[PDB]
């Protein structure tokens, strides 16, 4: 067979969640882009030293428990070196240079590209702020359905540099890859003696 | 037996003392030549003297943005295992590293070019890491001493 | 207009579809990029490094686990008997869990090809000796003595002449298949005075070019 | 954007659409296929064999089916008397629901062409005589003794020189329309001293290369 | 006429109920993939003995009685080899390797293709595993809705070899082709004599 | 009619989008424009006074 | 009267005794050679001898995959009918076979190639069913043997 499916494309490809925003009955919601939210898409990142790529949402929003209702919202992206919006009737959600949709929830969902952000070359993951989201309802009047939604990301036009060693240690923080001094644990598994096979 | 990094005068350390419970050194760069006599390459060479009774091995490769964790002479690592940033010793061999065993060869030396996002703006490290611990007779000499030499090339 | 119609399908939102959306920056120019060394195009080029292996993973060398990456030879042991035994699978459990290979054969589910596993000797120059490198095809039993381990597939390996030896794995595969290969005293360490009498030996392990995995899986 | 319209007949499921659809898996290459012998591209290619029938299916044989392949002959029988008798319908019950024509025609509704029809001795070699093989035309009437079933399509078949005849039908159809094979004593069976005194014919059968079959139905 | 409609393509087209999957007010069912489900579509494949296909799926979903509600739900694939979800909020719901599609009571149906998912070049009756689906609704609370769903499969791109004689007993059971020894039925029928057309 | 099918993404309203719409009026003809010194072509005309 | 498969030394078993209640004896390939003196191919010789004053018929078919079901000698079918695996023996000549008459010839041989999914790794067997059984008369021999060769070719 070919040598297609161990491709650097084909790795960063089948989109995952990324994010899960609940608003139940303040009305809005700041959720910042970032790569290293869940175990996942972190280890196999930090394969790699310097990346290049862009970026593709989708935002799959419906209740608590399955239904939809005829509700419009507006899920509005802040650039890099913008103001985020601080409430829910700011001046920010009426600002021209922040793109923004406008989706219905009885509608197939919004599918936002990203592109590369970064004032340098590629990104790099040891030493970016790609951006930030901004969902609300519309209107002036609080909407009595709660609502919840996820966001998947997918990942095009990968290209990679310097290879490194893989992680084998669980993370602490999210800023730096810090280890618990306690105790190392293996990265084998032990046996009784050398000779066991 | 040079080997450049990826495929594309002589400043002279301190010597380290390689005893019988060392762990390791790390050294960064370009941070130490800030004291002693922005766009370069380097060429660094590691040679240590030791008699044909001594035994052991180091692993001496470079490590591009090489970050640490919390639990000129450089700094002594203190969990070698993980190099005190959570990736593995026995995958250190993916970059470009060399093998310095005491049974056959005294020398290393590799090429290292520019590599960085911006092409004008700490690069990368150097770990020398006993793998194999030296061992010897009574009698012999305790210390062996290793010598680092940078020479800098087309500095800009 | 034009006549049109609904196929059944639409308004679905499939995770592994190549779909172009809209931009949601029409006006932007990113930045340029430059040469940067060290281009990875594929996952086989990390799969074809020697990295060091995890043999000596006993009970005891779990708190100094500095030790697990070299096993002892010595004088005291005698010839004819066993040194150290271990699979040769990248994905189960074992001394694979160690190398890049069977780290990145985890995100896979079916693999094959042949593998090479390359060993380093770090002892004093003026000793001499030989071992043997034995490897059972799979599907056979583990040898017993060094006699049947010499009639398989075998090389003679003395570290007064070289210092490294590879053995070339012929192939795996994952759908027992294990590949066990053995470490023999051929003849017994032998030092002048003032030379230390153990020594430690190193095992690296890569792939060879034939080695290819699908089948994508998430762990 | 491009002017649209929908179409009646959007949102609809229909089960035999040619409709391509999104691949599960895009990144994914399957095993690349190798020659295997005995490709079947069509279904008249298993429908052109010569399979054994069940003439002798009597109401004493459901114990015993191995009896069910083979009927009798016997020096006791006179001569000009009937043997035997069956229909040469394949979609009908009887002796064609043991033959692999009969079972892949109950699969399908409408099927024209002809037939073949192959016997073969299973005698003693010093035995002689011989057997008439009639076939009526359909619409006809069945023959009540051997002077009429020789005026229509007949073969006369000796088992002293050959071994196997080979009686083909003209044309059968299915939108009545059946045709009775007859099997007519000519003359006794003689057998000489030590020779068994009864033996047994297998009935073959097998399509011609004009047999179409069409409307597919489930059973 | 021609031989068109004879041909080994056309042999295993109109895809008819191969599942039927009631999940009434647990909340996820495990369907395992497997053509030998009925007594249709098992004779018709044990007539060769190696075959290659790929497989097309779709769920027309619904309520027990008739009527549609707008819930939205999801279909998981599993792979050979990857672990079941064995809860509601398992982990393996997340798993970025498994692919879903997510769709709604009021959308028409969801058409996936499964290609040829085993290792040898051809599947084997006589002596595979292609595949487990999972179907859950969204959300974290339960949904006051009674949930069916039906999955029809199609074959395409028939490819067959070593014809072998049709099963004409009963089946027992689903692993191997038994049968009852207490008594054999006959392939033909029975007649009184014969003489008698 | 031409079988089609509704990718993610329909019914909704990007604000940065080339979107070709239909006129409000499709037999209105504009005044043809003349010529005006002092065209502005790029901003970085201003920012190099 | 060489029959080929699909259009694509000499071991010699023992001697089966043909009863006159025999049902029928089934060996499988390539597990009767496991004891005596993957990927190869096959050209067995099934041959009796019987004398001109007896008459029968046997059904010599390969079957591949030919898996069995629940009620170098090789075993002796329960029911014939259905082979104890389901398929008739009227619909077993879609199988590459050949006819045993014992009025005319007294040999029978198949050439079956190479057959699997995989092309290196119980591949198929041989069904010998006696369809019309043996009859003779008083005074003759009560048993007529059968004897199977084995020829392998082309071996892997």
Known sequence: ?197 | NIVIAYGERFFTLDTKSWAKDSKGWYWKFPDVLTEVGYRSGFCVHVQCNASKFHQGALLVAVLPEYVLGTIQVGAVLTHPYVLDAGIPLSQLTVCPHQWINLRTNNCATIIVPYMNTVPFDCNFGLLVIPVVPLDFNAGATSEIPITVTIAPMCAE | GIPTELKPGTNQFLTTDDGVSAPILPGFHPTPPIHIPGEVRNLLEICRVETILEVNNLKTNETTPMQRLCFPVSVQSKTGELCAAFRADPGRDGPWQSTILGQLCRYYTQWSGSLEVTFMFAGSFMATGKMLIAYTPPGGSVPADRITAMLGTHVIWDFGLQSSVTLVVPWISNTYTTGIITIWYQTNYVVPIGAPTTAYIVALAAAQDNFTMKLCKDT
């Open chain 1, 1 to 197: 067979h070919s040598t297609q499916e161990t491709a650097i494309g084909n790795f960063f490809s089948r989109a995952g969640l990324v994010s899960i925003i609940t608003m139940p009955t303040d009305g809005y919601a700041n959720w910042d882009i970032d790569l290293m939210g869940y175990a996942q898409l972190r280890r196999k990142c930090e394969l790699f030293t310097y990346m290049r790529f862009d970026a593709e949402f989708t935002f799959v929003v419906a209740k608590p428990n399955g239904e939809l209702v005829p509700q419009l919202l507006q899920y509005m992206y802040v650039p890099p070196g913008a103001p985020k919006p601080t409430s829910r009737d700011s001046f920010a959600w009426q600002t021209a240079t922040n793109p923004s949709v406008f989706v219905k929830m009885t509608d197939p969902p919004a599918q936002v590209s990203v592109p590369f952000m970064s004032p340098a070359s590629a990104y790099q993951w040891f030493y970016n702020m790609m951006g930030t989201f901004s969902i609300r309802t519309v209107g002036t009047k609080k909407s009595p359905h709660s609502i919840t939604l996820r966001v998947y990301m997918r990942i095009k036009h990968v290209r990679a540099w310097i290879p490194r060693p893989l992680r084998n240690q669980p993370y602490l923080f999210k800023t730096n890859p810090n280890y618990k001094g306690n105790d190392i644990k293996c990265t084998s598994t032990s046996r009784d003696k050398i000779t066991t096979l």
